[PDB]
């Protein structure tokens, strides 16, 4: 995922009104407002964009190279039965008390 000369595709928000809610999602691009004067959607003196980009390359140290993260989450609402683990087996002998 790291290409020489900067790979500016992956963004990460670093300005927001208040912290998120668990498992919630926010994709807006409304210009932040830290001061007391309303912005009217123009960057500049106190009125910045909310999205930056990781510029991943190859000559970085550990702790700055791009890591890929996946998370699994289960939840058992009300279903009688659903996807379970895999089954296994043995054989099928005959004429024996088993």
């Amino acid at each position: 995922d790291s290409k020489v000369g900067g790979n500016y595709n992956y963004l990460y928000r670093l300005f927001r009104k208040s912290n998120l809610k668990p498992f919630e999602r926010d994709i807006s691009t409304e210009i932040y407002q830290a001061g007391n004067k309303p912005c009217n959607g123009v960057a500049g003196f106190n009125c910045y964009f909310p999205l930056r980009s990781y510029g991943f390359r190859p000559t970085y140290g550990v702790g700055h190279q791009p890591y890929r993260v996946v998370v699994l989450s289960f939840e058992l609402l009300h279903a009688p039965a659903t996807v379970c683990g895999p089954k296994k087996s043995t054989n099928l002998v005959k004429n024996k008390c088993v």
Binding site: L14, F15, A34, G35, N46, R52, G55
Partner: peptide, 20 residues
Amino acid sequence: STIEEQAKTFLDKFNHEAED
């Protein structure tokens, strides 16, 4: 907007850009 956040809140952005 505590007359200061407005400072820090800047400082961050600056930090990032600068470093890069």
